[PDB]
Amino acid sequence: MFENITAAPADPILGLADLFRADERPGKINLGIGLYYDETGKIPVLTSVKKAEQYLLENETTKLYLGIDGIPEFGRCTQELLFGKGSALINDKRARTAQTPGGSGALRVAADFLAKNTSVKRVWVSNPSWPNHKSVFNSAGLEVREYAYYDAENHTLDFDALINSLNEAQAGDVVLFHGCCHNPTGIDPTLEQWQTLAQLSVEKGWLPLFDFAYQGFARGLEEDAEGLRAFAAMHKELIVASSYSKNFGLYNERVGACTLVAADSETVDRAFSQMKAAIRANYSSPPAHGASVVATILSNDALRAIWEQELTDMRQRIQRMRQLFVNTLQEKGANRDFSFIIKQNGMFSFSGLTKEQVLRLREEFGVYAVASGRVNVAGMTPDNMAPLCEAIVAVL
Amino acid sequence: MFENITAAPADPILGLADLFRADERPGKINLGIGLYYDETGKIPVLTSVKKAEQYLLENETTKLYLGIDGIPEFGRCTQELLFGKGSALINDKRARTAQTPGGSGALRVAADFLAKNTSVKRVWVSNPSWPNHKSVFNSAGLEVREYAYYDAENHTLDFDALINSLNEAQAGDVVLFHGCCHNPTGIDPTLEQWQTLAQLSVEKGWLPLFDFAYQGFARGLEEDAEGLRAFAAMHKELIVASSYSKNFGLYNERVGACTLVAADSETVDRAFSQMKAAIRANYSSPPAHGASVVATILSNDALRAIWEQELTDMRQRIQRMRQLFVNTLQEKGANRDFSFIIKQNGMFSFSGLTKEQVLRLREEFGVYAVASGRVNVAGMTPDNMAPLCEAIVAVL
Numbered sequence: 176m177f178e179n180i181t182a183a184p185a186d187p188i189l190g191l192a193d194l195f196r197a198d199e200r201p202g203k204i205n206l207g208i209g210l211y212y213d214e215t216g217k218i219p220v221l222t223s224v225k226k227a228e229q230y231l232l233e234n235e236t237t238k239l240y241l242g243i244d245g246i247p248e249f250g251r252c253t254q255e256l257l258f259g260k261g262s263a264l265i266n267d268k269r270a271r272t273a274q275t276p277g278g279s280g281a282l283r284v285a286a287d288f289l290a291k292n293t294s295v296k297r298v299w300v301s302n303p304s305w306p307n308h309k310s311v312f313n314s315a316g317l318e319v320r321e322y323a324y325y326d327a328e329n330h331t332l333d334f335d336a337l338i339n340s341l342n343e344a345q346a347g348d349v350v351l352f353h354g355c356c357h358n359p360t361g362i363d364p365t366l367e368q369w370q371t372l373a374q375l376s377v378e379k380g381w382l383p384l385f386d387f388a389y390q391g392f393a394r395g396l397e398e399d400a401e402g403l404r405a406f407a408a409m410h411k412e413l414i415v416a417s418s419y420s421k422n423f424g425l426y427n428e429r430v431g432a433c434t435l436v437a438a439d440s441e442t443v444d445r446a447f448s449q450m451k452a453a454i455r456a457n458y459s460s461p462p463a464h465g466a467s468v469v470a471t472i473l474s475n476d477a478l479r480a481i482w483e484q485e486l487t488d489m490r491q492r493i494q495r496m497r498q499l500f501v502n503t504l505q506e507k508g509a510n511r512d513f514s515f516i517i518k519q520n521g522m523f524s525f526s527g528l529t530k531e532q533v534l535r536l537r538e539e540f541g542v543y544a545v546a547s548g549r550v551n552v553a554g555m556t557p558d559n560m561a562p563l564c565e566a567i568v569a570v571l
Numbered sequence: 572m573f574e575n576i577t578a579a580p581a582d583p584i585l586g587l588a589d590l591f592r593a594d595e596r597p598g599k600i601n602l603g604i605g606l607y608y609d610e611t612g613k614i615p616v617l618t619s620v621k622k623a624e625q626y627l628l629e630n631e632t633t634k635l636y637l638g639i640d641g642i643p644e645f646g647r648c649t650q651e652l653l654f655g656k657g658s659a660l661i662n663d664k665r666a667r668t669a670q671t672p673g674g675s676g677a678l679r680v681a682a683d684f685l686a687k688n689t690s691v692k693r694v695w696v697s698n699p700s701w702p703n704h705k706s707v708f709n710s711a712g713l714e715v716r717e718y719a720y721y722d723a724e725n726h727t728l729d730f731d732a733l734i735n736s737l738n739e740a741q742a743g744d745v746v747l748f749h750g751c752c753h754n755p756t757g758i759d760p761t762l763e764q765w766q767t768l769a770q771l772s773v774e775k776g777w778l779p780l781f782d783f784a785y786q787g788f789a790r791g792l793e794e795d796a797e798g799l800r801a802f803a804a805m806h807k808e809l810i811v812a813s814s815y816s817k818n819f820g821l822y823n824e825r826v827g828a829c830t831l832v833a834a835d836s837e838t839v840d841r842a843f844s845q846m847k848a849a850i851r852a853n854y855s856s857p858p859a860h861g862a863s864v865v866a867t868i869l870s871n872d873a874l875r876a877i878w879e880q881e882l883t884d885m886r887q888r889i890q891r892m893r894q895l896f897v898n899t900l901q902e903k904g905a906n907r908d909f910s911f912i913i914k915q916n917g918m919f920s921f922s923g924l925t926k927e928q929v930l931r932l933r934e935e936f937g938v939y940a941v942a943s944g945r946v947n948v949a950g951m952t953p954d955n956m957a958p959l960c961e962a963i964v965a966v967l
């Protein structure tokens with residue numbers, strides 16, 4: 176039965192880490208996968224998290240299945256982070272959140288939900304986009320179309336190009352937006368552009384789907400929610416796929432959420448029932464650990480204060496490595512002018528290196544960047560900055 | 572977009588838990604969902620688990636994404652528990668295991684894998700079977716057919732009916748077997764019926780799929796693996812969906828595995844790349860906690876020794892409630908003879924109560940039993956025995 180199975184191609188991202196892990200070279204650098212690293216080059220557990228884990232260790236008395244939609248309080252806190260103190264969505268009981276296994280799991284969930292309960296046929300994703308996006312949608316039998324987004328020549332958001340691209344998108348079509356920290360570009364619309372887009376999708380009849388995996392890494396918790404929030408003010412309906420993988424360093428515990436928003440409660444409940452159904456036929460209930468850690472942290476004023484500060488510490492550190500990257504490049508005599516690098520937010524940067532230069536960097540210098548030339552800034556450190564910056568310069 | 576969504580029908584199992592919750596009646600008894608309770612009526616964390624958890628608390632230095640297939644040690648450990656210490660399967664590098672989010676997610680992973688990569692068009696599940704089976708397979712766009720299995724009249728496995736209905740299973744059709752502790756019947760084939768079944772499927776060209784969710788609750792670890800192990804001895808190809816939910820009390824942490832078996836390494840590797848592909852488009856990578864907990868325990872001789880004893884205590888305890896159940900019934904009225912109840916394995920007994928009798932137990936007496944008339948013996952305790960058995964005599 177398996178005699179003819181074809182080996183699957185490799186994950187452009189995931190499969191890189193393997194390549195990395197397997198290289199016996201000494202001073203290898205990893206600018207591939209988006210993982211936050213510290214000054215010392217390690218991927219640490221936040222202390223707020225260790226604090227929460229102790230608490231759970233001490234207080235948990237059962238491992239009883241969670242509800243299909245997960246830990247209630249986790250949900251509540253998620254909606255508050257997403258939408259705000261007074262948001263109507265909340266007061267109007269217009270949003271239902273399901274805790275899922277990662278931001279990834281929430282995308283699949285929304286996908287299966289849409290493919291089975293709606294007349295959605297295609298999903299519009301930006302170009303470029305996070306490669307996993309097409310696979311997840313394709314798996315649910317949905318069609319993935321792309322909309323222009325990035326001005327490579329200028330290193331910015333090509334608004335009209337974007338706008339002109341979407342016009343081709345029909346009403347009842349799903350339009351996928353990155354909450355903040357566009358992966359892989361690092362360019363996010365301005366509050367006005369977001370406003371625009373908002374009004375626009377209202378009129379075109381688009382279902383907005385937000386992929387929000389970096390809340391807190393661009394400007395801040397509350398500011399990075401501005402575009403969502405602008406959409407949330409005009410829309411009856413929307414879907415939100417958030418992740419706690421990055422802002423809490425909980426990568427492997429698979430923590431994320433799927434938020435559904437209908438015009439009203441009677442509606443959101445019905446729909447949600449369909450979403451829970453989709454979950455039931457998938458993994459059933461979500462893993463409690465990571466989510467319990469998150470609810471604890473956001474529930475508690477002390478822990479929360481501590482976590483928020485570690486988050487602000489991670490962000491500021493990336494902001495710092497960015498300035499450091501540009502200057503060191505420059506100080507090493509790079510051809511090009513890399514200052515656009517500073518106007519980018521989040522962990523990455525679209526470095527503008529060719530497929531061949533990234534290949535070269537790897538084989539030759541042991542530097543691992545994604546073929547898109549996407550470099551993980553959060554993987555840079557004052558110690559590797561020099562060697563990193565030289566290989567780049569040697570390939571330019 | 573969500574205007575016309577119809578609400579779904581609640582989980583025939585999960586649904587009840589909700590009702591249960593919502594029920595204010597002081598002395599409610601919950602014989603629905605399969606959760607192991609203790610003398611005191613609580614659903615506890617295993618000691619070996621708390622121990623492994625502290626260990627992680629103190630030793631983990633990163634939350635770094637796991638591989639798509641999860642913890643290697645976990646895989647190794649599961650294979651050994653499945654096939655046995657020195658299996659050929661293991662020496663010939665013929666089995667690849669993926670850590671999954673519960674036995675559930677492992678079923679969905681095998682499903683999606685099958686649907687997308689093999690031309691399997693239908694799945695044969697026993698009747699009666701675990702309700703969630705249909706939904707998983709169906710979601711993968713797979714056809715669920717049923718094969719005869721239980722002799723309602725004499726409370727047993729109807730071998731002929733079994734055999735006779737499988738004839739209509741074409742070659743290359745997937746045949747789903749319960750490794751042990753048949754859910755919901757409690758009747759499992761004898762090594763000989765397994766042997767025979769084995770032979771048959773070879774001869775008929777079926778792909779065997781094992782749902783192994785109760786390893787260790789019937790007789791013991793090794794003893795419950797004799798059916799599988801027999802099949803692994805004749806098969807070239809196999810799939811195993813196993814859960815650590817019940818035997819480790821790790822319900823909410825989502826711990827299970829999906830083991831693929833092929834004629835050889837090359838084959839298994841190729842195939843498995845396809846399985847990993849299906850995972851990627853799903854939840855990406857699995858939740859570490861639970862599995863880490865499982866690997867820690869099974870790799871450490873001491874913790875392992877403590878765990879096997881807790882497992883053995885759980886099993887023994889169920890066996891006790893079993894004989895006490897029948898005895899109490901008798902000793903309290905009961906027109907029927909419930910002795911068949913003692914030859915049944917695992918957590919539940921197929922009580923032979925009707926849909927209306929169960930409705931009544933609930934409504935009237937506050938006892939929760941599935942509509943199939945399936946009762947969780949593990950939820951029975953010396954303290955609730957009496958009342959339970961009395962409200963049982965009241966509906967006969």
Ligand SMILES: *Cc1c(COP(=O)(O)O)cnc(C)c1O
Nearest residue numbers: 277278279305358388418420431
């Ligand atoms: C990381 C990421 C996700 C989800 O990641 P998880 O680990 O599954 O939470 C989703 N979208 C983008 C753009 C991401 O970078």
Ligand SMILES: *Cc1c(COP(=O)(O)O)cnc(C)c1O
Nearest residue numbers: 673674675701754782784814816
């Ligand atoms: C409980 C159960 C499973 C797996 O449950 P998980 O909690 O997802 O591991 C699989 N099969 C049967 C028959 C079960 O009863």
Ligand SMILES: O=C(O)CCc1c[nH]c2ccccc12
Nearest residue numbers: 459584585603604605675703
């Ligand atoms: O009753 C069972 O089969 C085990 C408990 C149970 C009810 N619904 C479930 C769905 C997934 C996993 C386990 C369960």
